[PDB]
Amino acid sequence: VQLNQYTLKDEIGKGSYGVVKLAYNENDNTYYAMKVLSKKPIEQVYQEIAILKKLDHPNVVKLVEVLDDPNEDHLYMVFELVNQGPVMEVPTLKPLSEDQARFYFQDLIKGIEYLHYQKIIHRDIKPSNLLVGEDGHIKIADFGVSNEFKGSDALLSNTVGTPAFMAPESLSETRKIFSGKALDVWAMGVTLYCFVFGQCPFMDERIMCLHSKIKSQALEFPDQPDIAEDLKDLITRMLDKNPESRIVVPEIKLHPWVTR
Ligand SMILES: Cc1[nH]c(/C=C2\C(=O)Nc3ccccc32)c(C)c1CCC(=O)O
């Protein structure tokens, strides 16, 4: 299977919106990650492309080129390959050590701060969208449901993303307006909890009960593994159900657990 200079190889991931295949560029003897889409709706794809084109940061995946033939049902987004893949699988019985979690969380902070400075809300932060690069550092992937805003913050009313990572203020049964940056912070807190415990803090196979726990169940830390108190403080602050008192990224950067 060829597509201009690219040979499609085996699958390497299903994010949101498509499937990703390893791809060999015969012109430069280099592997890439190719997202393949079947037109099934397409406005959102070209907004992801437009967002990706604006971004250039070591902790954000790099869109290389787009292959769109109007006579083809398939549309191809070529990314730079992130050779080591997602930072971890959730759930797992072998979570990261605190020191490993901090190393990756520092990259996540820098990438989110950059995205927000670029006026992008990611909306799907989770470990499987955090890819480990050649040098061991994280690259944030999958902008399939990201939002671009004008002004100081996004003012949003739509519910998108991965259910276990959705912030409780996005789960009102009344299309209320909520702000964007705090959504990414919440998902960062669920992500950090996942790093050290290997499962999400709020879990239910019944989607109604999952929504209800995100919105109303107090955060509980397992007895094991035994994590430091300042890490518990940081996670608690990011998983503040009230978005107005939830910790903000300029504070996360300063948090004692982050800086030691
Ligand atoms: C650039 C890139 N790589 C991948 C996947 C992998 C990658 O690169 N090495 C890997 C090594 C092992 C497993 C997956 C991967 C994805 C999902 C994306 C982004 C796709 C997107 O943003 O929608």
Ligand SMILES: [Cl-]
């Ligand atoms: Cl995940």
